[PDB]
C-alpha cells in the first residue's frame, strides 16, 4: 500500500437541541494526527499525535477556520438535503464526507477521491477525472447540477493534487520516527480445548503497524491496541502476510 | 434574505462618534467590513467568522473598532470622527470562502457644524411651447437647490405612480459656489412625455426629492426648522390646447 | 497591487461589445468575481468564474485564463443602463479576496436623429424664475461650465422614452440675475 492523507467529517442534526454535532479527524496512513469537535466552548483544531504538538498558531488558526467554515456549510447542507427528501424538522439525519490524496512509490500524486453520504448511504461522489460529480439519487442530481455550475470540482482538484500532497509530504517528515518506521506482527498460536472431542486453534498477530494484514489458515475484525499498533486473530497451518516482514511467516 | 445595513446615510459633527450596524444573510458565517472612497475599490477593515474576529487591517486606526457579540449582527464604531473618515462603509457576508455579497452600505458625511446642513428647495419648470410644436415632445425639468450635504434621491411621480421611462437625473450634484469647501449643492432632472400627454390637464406631474439630513437624536439649537431627513416635492399639471 | 484594472474611463457606443480586463498576481488564485457598481450604490455581484474558459449569463461573458493570469468581462449589445464602475475581485491560493480599483464604463447612447436645440421653461408656481434646456444633441457633444459664476450649467444626461423607442440627451442651465439669455448659455 501507498502513503495517504485522509479526513473523515461527520455532521449530525439535533432537532430542538440547537446546531448540529460536527467532528473532523485527520489520518496520515493509519495514524490519526488531528481532530476538530464543534461541541468544545471555543472549538479549535487540536493535535492528536505527539509530532503535531510543535506546530505554530498560524497552522491551528487556519485549520480551526477551515473546520468552522466546513461545520457551517455542513449545517446548511443538512437543511438543504432535508428539503430534497421532504423530511420533517423533528428527526436527526447524518452528513458524512471523506476525502484523501495518495502518493506513489515516486512521492508524486497517485490518486484523489471525495464522497458524501446522507444517513449512511452514498449520496455524491467525485469522479476519477477530478472534474465532475456522480449522483446516486434524484435528490443528489440537484447537488450534481449545483456542484457542476459552481466549479466545486476545480477547488477539490487543486486541494487533492497540490495542497493535500504538499502537506502529506510535510507530515511524513515531521513524524518520520513513527510513520515511516514499520512494526511487523509478533505471531504465536494458542491451544483452547472445547472438550476431549474437539479443540480450537487461534493464530495471533499483535503490535503491528500498519493495519493491513492477512491471516489465512472464524476471522475477527482488526482492532487497535491503543499505543498506535493493531491486533488480529483467526480460528477453526496459519499463514500471516504483512508489509513489515520480508516473507509470510507460517 | 440580503445583507441589511443601517443607517443608509449618516451626518455627524467632526469630533463626534458614530456606530453603524450590519445584519448578514442568515446561513452566512463570515461578516466583512470595507470602506470605499470615490473611484477606488473596497478597502478591507476587519472580518468575523461567526463571533470570532479573525483579522483587522494592519493600517486600521485605533479610532475604528467592530464587534459581533451574538455571532449575528455586527457594529462598526468610529470614535472622534474626522473629515477624512467621510466614505461608504460596506458590510459583506459569505458562507465560508464562497462569494462575498454586499449590503446597501452606510454613507458617512462628517461636517464642520450641523448649522451647515440645509434641506433642498424644489421647483418644477413647465415645458417650452417651442419644444412642443418642433418635436411633439414635452420636457419637464426639476431643480433641487441649496441642500447640504450631497445626500439626495430625486424621483418623478405621474398620477400617483413613480415613473422611470423618459426620466434622466444629473449624474452628481453641482456646487452653488465652487469657491467654498462647505458649498451647498444643486441637482437637476428631466421628465419627457408626448406633447399630447402634457396637454391632458388631468395629468399630475410631481418631482419628489428625498433628503438625508439629521436624525431625531441630533440636538438642534437654532430658529430655522431642524434639517431632518425629509421629502420635498414640487408639482405641475398639464396645460390644455 | 495583487489585482490590476485600467481605472481610466472606457467609452463605448451603444451596441458595441465592451471588453473589461483584469490581471492578478497569485498564479494559484482560486476564484474570480465581477461586481457592477452604479454611482452612489453598493457593488452587485454579476459574474463568478473559477475554471479556465468562459461563463455566459445574458449579455455578459466572463473569460478566465490561469496561464496569462487574465480575467475579462464582455458586455454584448452594451446599453447605457450598463454605464457603471466594474470591480474585479480575486481570491488568492489562501482564499483571501482583493478588489481592484475598478474600471468606469460609459456606454454612449445611440442618437439616430440629432436636432440640437435650446429652449426656456418657467416655474409652475412663479412666472419670475426660468431654466434653459439644451436638448436633442448627439453623444459626442461636449457641455461646458460658464464663466459668470452666477450661471450654473449641468453635465449631459440621456433619458429613454421606452414606449416610442426614442432616446435624447439633455443639459440644464439657470441663474438668479435675470440679465440671463437662454440662447447663449450653452458653449
Amino acid at each position: 500500500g501507498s502513503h495517504s492523507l485522509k479526513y473523515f467529517h461527520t455532521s449530525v442534526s439535533r432537532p430542538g437541541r440547537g446546531e448540529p454535532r460536527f467532528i473532523s479527524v485527520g489520518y496520515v496512513d493509519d495514524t490519526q494526527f488531528v481532530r476538530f469537535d464543534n461541541d468544545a466552548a471555543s472549538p479549535r483544531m487540536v493535535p492528536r499525535a505527539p509530532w503535531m504538538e510543535q506546530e505554530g498558531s498560524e497552522y491551528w488558526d487556519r485549520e480551526t477556520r477551515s473546520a468552522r467554515d466546513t461545520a457551517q456549510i455542513f449545517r446548511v447542507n443538512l437543511r438543504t438535503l432535508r428539503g430534497y427528501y421532504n423530511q420533517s424538522e423533528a428527526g436527526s439525519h447524518t452528513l458524512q464526507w471523506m476525502h484523501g490524496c495518495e502518493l506513489g512509490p515516486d512521492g508524486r500524486f497517485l490518486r484523489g477521491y471525495e464522497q458524501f453520504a446522507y444517513d449512511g448511504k452514498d449520496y455524491l461522489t467525485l469522479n476519477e477525472d477530478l472534474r465532475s460529480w456522480t449522483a446516486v439519487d434524484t435528490a443528489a442530481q440537484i447537488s450534481e447540477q449545483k456542484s457542476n455550475d459552481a466549479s466545486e470540482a476545480e477547488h477539490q482538484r487543486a486541494y487533492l493534487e497540490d495542497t493535500c500532497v504538499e502537506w502529506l509530504h510535510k507530515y511524513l517528515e515531521k513524524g518520520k520516527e513513527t510513520l515511516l518506521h514499520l512494526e511487523p506482527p509478533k505471531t504465536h498460536v494458542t491451544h483452547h480445548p472445547i472438550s476431549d472431542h474437539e479443540a480450537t486453534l487461534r493464530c495471533w498477530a499483535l503490535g503491528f503497524y500498519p493495519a493491513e494484514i492477512t491471516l489465512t489458515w472464524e476471522l475477527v475484525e482488526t482492532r487497535p491496541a491503543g499505543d498506535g499498533t493493531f491486533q488480529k486473530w483467526a480460528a477453526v497451518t496459519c499463514h500471516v502476510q504483512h508489509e513489515g516482514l520480508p516473507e509470510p511467516v507460517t | 434574505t440580503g445583507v441589511s445595513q443601517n443607517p443608509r446615510h449618516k451626518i455627524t459633527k467632526r469630533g463626534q462618534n458614530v456606530t453603524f450596524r450590519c445584519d448578514p444573510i442568515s446561513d452566512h458565517n463570515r461578516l466583512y467590513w470595507y470602506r470605499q472612497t470615490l473611484g477606488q475599490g473596497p478597502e478591507f477593515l476587519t472580518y468575523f467568522q461567526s463571533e470570532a474576529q479573525l483579522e483587522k487591517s494592519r493600517l486600521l486606526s485605533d479610532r475604528f473598532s467592530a464587534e459581533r457579540p451574538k455571532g449575528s449582527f455586527s457594529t462598526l464604531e468610529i470614535q472622534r470622527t474626522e473629515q477624512g473618515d467621510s466614505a461608504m462603509y460596506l458590510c459583506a457576508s459569505s458562507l465560508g470562502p464562497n462569494e462575498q455579497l454586499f449590503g446597501p452600505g452606510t454613507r458617512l458625511t462628517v461636517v464642520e457644524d450641523l448649522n451647515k446642513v440645509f434641506p433642498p428647495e424644489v421647483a418644477v419648470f413647465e415645458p417650452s411651447e417651442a419644444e412642443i410644436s418642433h418635436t411633439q415632445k414635452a420636457t419637464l425639468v426639476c431643480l433641487a437647490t441649496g441642500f447640504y450635504p450631497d445626500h439626495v434621491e430625486l424621483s418623478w411621480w405621474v398620477n400617483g405612480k413613480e415613473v422611470h421611462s423618459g426620466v434622466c437625473t444629473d449624474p452628481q450634484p453641482l456646487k452653488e459656489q465652487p469657491a467654498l469647501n462647505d458649498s451647498r449643492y444643486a441637482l437637476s432632472s428631466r421628465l419627457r412625455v408626448s406633447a399630447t400627454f402634457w396637454q391632458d390637464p388631468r395629468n399630475h406631474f410631481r418631482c419628489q426629492v428625498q433628503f438625508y439630513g439629521l436624525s431625531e437624536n441630533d440636538e438642534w439649537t437654532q430658529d430655522r426648522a431642524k434639517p431632518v431627513t425629509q421629502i420635498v416635492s414640487a408639482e405641475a399639471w398639464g396645460r390644455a390646447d | 497591487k495583487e489585482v490590476e484594472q485600467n481605472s481610466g474611463p472606457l467609452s463605448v457606443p451603444e451596441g458595441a461589445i465592451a471588453s473589461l480586463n483584469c490581471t492578478y498576481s497569485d498564479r494559484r488564485s482560486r476564484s474570480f468575481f465581477w461586481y457592477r457598481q452604479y454611482s452612489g450604490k453598493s457593488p452587485e455581484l454579476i459574474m463568478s468564474i473559477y475554471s479556465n474558459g468562459d461563463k455566459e449569463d445574458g449579455r455578459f461573458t466572463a473569460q478566465l485564463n490561469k496561464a496569462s493570469q487574465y480575467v475579462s468581462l464582455l458586455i454584448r449589445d452594451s446599453q447605457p443602463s450598463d454605464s457603471a464602475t466594474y470591480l474585479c475581485a480575486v481570491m488568492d491560493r489562501e482564499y483571501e479576496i482583493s478588489f481592484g480599483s475598478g474600471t468606469r464604463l460609459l456606454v454612449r447612447p445611440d442618437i439616430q436623429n440629432p436636432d440640437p436645440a435650446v429652449y426656456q421653461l418657467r416655474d409652475s408656481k412663479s412666472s419670475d424664475k426660468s431654466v434653459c434646456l439644451f436638448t436633442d444633441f448627439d453623444s459626442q457633444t461636449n457641455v461646458s461650465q460658464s464663466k459668470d459664476s452666477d450661471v450654473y450649467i449641468t453635465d449631459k444626461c440621456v433619458l429613454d422614452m421606452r414606449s416610442m423607442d426614442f432616446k435624447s440627451n439633455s443639459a440644464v442651465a439657470w441663474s438668479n440675475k435675470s440679465d440671463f439669455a437662454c440662447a447663449n448659455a450653452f458653449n
Partner: peptide, 9 residues
C-alpha cells in the same frame, strides 16, 4: 491540512 471550501449540496 483541510480543504478551505467544503462543497455546497
Amino acid at each position: 491540512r483541510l480543504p478551505a471550501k467544503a462543497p455546497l449540496l
